[PDB]
């Protein structure tokens, strides 16, 4: 049976990428929160 | 011989007895081709102190003269009788007035007692494979009951409210637990009303052939593309063809119930 995760590099960058986050306001808020916590990796 | 008597037949008697009080009038369906043998003394013993009318359904398949004579015999016997065709309403219009005339005594007594007239409660009873449900469907114009071309279709009694005028009770067919006269059993098996997988079809075919030879020799002569009246049965059986040695018995009984022959009656 097909499991729910079928990896693909293009869609991952198009949806959870840095520029997609920076395009809208809520993505910028997400980036700000992740910077505040101090996570080593942010966006995707 | 013929013994068919399942448990739902036994339960039907008890249910009818337990719901006897509500009944106002009874319709007793009787086949026209065999008016005397189709009566059920077992259910008649339970049924007393109740007015009733004899109905002759499937009247298109029987000879008119013998049916009318039997109608006279029932009439002067001391009971009302009528001839009806269920599939196409022939005498269905003249039963509501008869019921009204019969029950008028209690109706006027109740009216003078100080209540509004109410609906007539009727119970339909008879042997299986007779128009016990087709008649109800025609009367109600609704096609509410289940009908089939084999005995034993319905299994439980049911109330049907035809307008504000009639309350009909239906009932599965009932047969007496043990037969006594083999000729009556043979006639019943010929007309249907039996599962046909419990009986011997060869004897039924023999009875049919001998009755035909005795009564309608011309109809036996025309038959189906053959003209002979020998002493045995194997002459007619092998008309149109290893061929079925005696399975053609079914053929003999197949057409007759569908009136491939002309109208006839056994009385």
């Amino acid at each position: 049976m097909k499991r729910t995760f079928q990896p693909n590099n293009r869609k991952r960058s198009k949806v959870h990428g840095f520029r997609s986050r920076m395009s809208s306001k809520n993505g910028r808020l997400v980036l700000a929160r992740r910077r505040r916590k101090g996570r080593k990796v942010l966006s995707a | 011989t013929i013994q068919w008597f399942p448990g739902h037949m036994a339960k039907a008697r008890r249910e009818v007895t337990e719901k006897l009080k509500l009944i106002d009038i009874v319709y007793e369906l009787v086949d026209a081709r065999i008016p005397m043998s189709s009566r059920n003394p077992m259910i008649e013993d339970i049924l007393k102190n109740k007015p009733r009318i004899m109905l002759l359904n499937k009247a298109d398949k029987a000879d008119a003269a013998v049916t009318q004579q039997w109608k006279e015999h029932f009439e002067n016997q001391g009971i009302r009788s009528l001839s009806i065709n269920s599939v196409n309403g022939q005498g269905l219009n003249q039963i509501v007035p008869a019921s009204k005339e019969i029950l008028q005594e209690k109706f006027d007594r109740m009216r003078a007692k100080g209540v509004k007239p109410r609906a007539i409660r009727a119970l339909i009873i008879g042997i299986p494979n007779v128009g016990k449900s087709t008649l109800i469907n025609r009367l109600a114009k609704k096609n509410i009951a289940k009908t089939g071309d084999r005995p034993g279709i319905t299994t439980s009694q049911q109330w049907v409210k035809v307008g504000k005028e009639l309350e009909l009770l239906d009932t599965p067919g009932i047969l007496w637990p043990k037969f006594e006269d083999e000729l009556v059993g043979l006639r019943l098996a010929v007309t249907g009303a039996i599962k046909d997988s419990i009986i011997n079809l060869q004897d039924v075919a023999v009875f049919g052939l001998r009755f035909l030879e005795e009564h309608y020799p011309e109809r036996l002569k025309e038959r189906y593309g053959l003209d002979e009246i020998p002493e045995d049965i194997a002459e007619l059986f092998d008309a149109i063809g290893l061929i079925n040695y005696d399975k053609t018995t079914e053929v003999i009984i197949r057409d007759i119930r569908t009136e491939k022959f002309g109208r006839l009656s056994f009385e």
Binding site: - | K19, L22, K113, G114, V115, K116
Partner: protein, 214 residues
Amino acid sequence: TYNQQEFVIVDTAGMRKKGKVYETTEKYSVLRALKAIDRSEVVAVVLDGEEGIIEQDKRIAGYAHEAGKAVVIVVNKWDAVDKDESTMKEFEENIRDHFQFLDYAPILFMSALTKKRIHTLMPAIIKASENHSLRVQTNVLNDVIMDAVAMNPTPSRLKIYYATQVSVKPPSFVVFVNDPELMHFSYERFLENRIRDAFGFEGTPIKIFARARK
């Protein structure tokens, strides 16, 4: 006096919605109008024929029904809308669809401006006068009860033991049962229809009370 019979007639200045009646104590008259119903025993509800059935009309008819008084639904001003065949049934059927809670009330049509069929109002009134005050025999009433429950043996199981009448107006009836909790509003309404069909009981509400095994 009408047909060698005396009568009393009262007007009530109309009734409007409770929410928008925030007047300067001029709505104090509505209390007077409500009082007349208590002293009256036949209620005539009037609807306009030019206008359709308004929601407030159903509410007003509720007060009369809850007071246990005979009701005769009346419509006026047919001179406005068309008088034709099957225009009789357009509002005759529509009223039944909307005014379900009262079905015993007879329906009368008359226009006061042109004085059409005005004299037919009283024939309705006198008939309704009797039914609001009527008693049925105790023997007969009981005999009808178990006929209804026999054809509908779906009341553990609720048991019916007795039935009789208490009041003349409106006709109250009490049935002795093993427990009145088993009584269902669907079944209670069922008993009323059979009683309303056994006899006339036209143009008057009916109330049924239930008593325990005692």
